[PDB]
Design a binder for this molecule. Structure first.
Ligand SMILES: CN1CCN(Cc2ccc(NC(=O)Nc3ccc(Oc4ccnc(N)n4)cc3)cc2C(F)(F)F)CC1
Ligand SMILES: CN1CCN(Cc2ccc(NC(=O)Nc3ccc(Oc4ccnc(N)n4)cc3)cc2C(F)(F)F)CC1
Length: 284
């Protein structure tokens, strides 16, 4: 690690620590994720993260550059991205993120997610803190979980998970992304729940309590209760007042209750909302 200078801690959990560093020789600016190695016939669990990053090489996925084994430590070296979308949303809350940028970011996120999904990989925890932007207008998927190896906000959690589904589909990530879309536009989290029930009922109150017509199978899910509160769906025009027709349409398809009817990543990319998509640079 002798070439890494200006090293400063930027993240930490029980399993990982993350730093910003600058290679003093190459000038490359990097993020370093430190993992402690235990005693090693079962594969060492850091291999999963490395494998996924290698497999998911893509312009809108965080880029693993190197792996450095030193003492009883492994350092994953990443290309450095300026900040996360959460920080960008907070910095842009007075004025809002311009619509051309929201559109570019949603498009890019859909491209990264379509790539994951084409490899049968589910993200499962999409949220602003797991999305990284650079100075040049790109946004990239990451998973900044530092609690454990690859192998808790509920705000972006799909309703089927909340209702006890044993099998997650690619639709769970589309739901999370719909919520993120809405949040970019309104400047506030769409479903900011503080527990499983509060989260579920926030969804029901905005979108209406689902029934067998809207979501065949809903009443048979493990944690469904026929005594659930019954709300009628709100005017979606009032849910995301700033969004135009094309925007509302796309969002309503990302937020379809039925995971089998929820729009896919690939099909979202062809929505008319994206017809005039460009690549604006954020002001940072
Ligand atoms: C169940 N799911 C299975 C598939 N998984 C894929 C998966 C798995 C692991 C990872 N790892 C990961 O981002 N590390 C990771 C993320 C951020 C980080 O810190 C950085 C990096 C760059 N700049 C700045 N400022 N700070 C360091 C290190 C990333 C993904 C991704 F991007 F594809 F989503 C997600 C989980
Ligand atoms: C239009 N309006 C809709 C809302 N209405 C009130 C209303 C009506 C019905 C309900 N029903 C409801 O929480 N059931 C309900 C919720 C959870 C549950 O699951 C549990 C409980 C304990 N342990 C475990 N493991 N699992 C069982 C059962 C809750 C409300 C509330 F909270 F909003 F006040 C008034 C009229």
């Amino acid at each position: 690690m002798e070439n890494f200078q200006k090293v400063e801690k930027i993240g930490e959990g029980t399993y990982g620590v993350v730093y910003k560093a600058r290679n003093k020789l190459t000038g490359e600016v990097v993020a370093l994720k430190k993992i402690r190695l235990d005693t090693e016939g079962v594969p060492s669990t850091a291999i999963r993260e490395i494998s996924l990053l290698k497999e998911l090489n893509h312009p809108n996925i965080v880029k693993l550059l190197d792996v450095i084994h030193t003492e009883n430590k492994l350092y994953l070296v990443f290309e450095f991205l300026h900040q996360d979308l959460k920080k960008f949303m907070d910095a842009s809350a007075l004025t809002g993120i311009p619509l051309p940028l929201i559109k570019s970011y949603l498009f890019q996120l859909l491209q990264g997610l379509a790539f994951c999904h084409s490899h049968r990989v589910l993200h499962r925890d999409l949220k602003p803190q797991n999305l990284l932007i650079n100075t040049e207008g790109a946004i990239k998927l990451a998973d900044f979980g530092l609690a454990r190896a690859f192998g808790v906000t509920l705000w972006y959690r799909a309703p089927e998970i909340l209702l006890g589904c044993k099998y997650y589909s690619t639709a769970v990530d589309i739901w999370s992304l719909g919520c993120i879309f809405a949040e970019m536009v309104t400047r506030r989290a769409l479903f900011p729940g503080d527990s499983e029930i509060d989260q579920l009922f926030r969804i029901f109150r905005t979108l209406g309590t689902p029934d067998e017509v809207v979501w065949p199978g809903v009443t048979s899910m493990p944690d469904y209760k026929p005594s659930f509160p019954k709300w009628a769906r709100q005017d979606f025009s009032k849910v995301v007042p700033p969004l135009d027709e094309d925007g509302r349409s796309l969002l309503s398809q990302m937020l379809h209750y039925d995971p089998n009817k929820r729009i896919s990543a690939k099909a979202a990319l062809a929505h008319p909302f994206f017809q005039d998509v460009t690549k604006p640079v954020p002001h940072l």
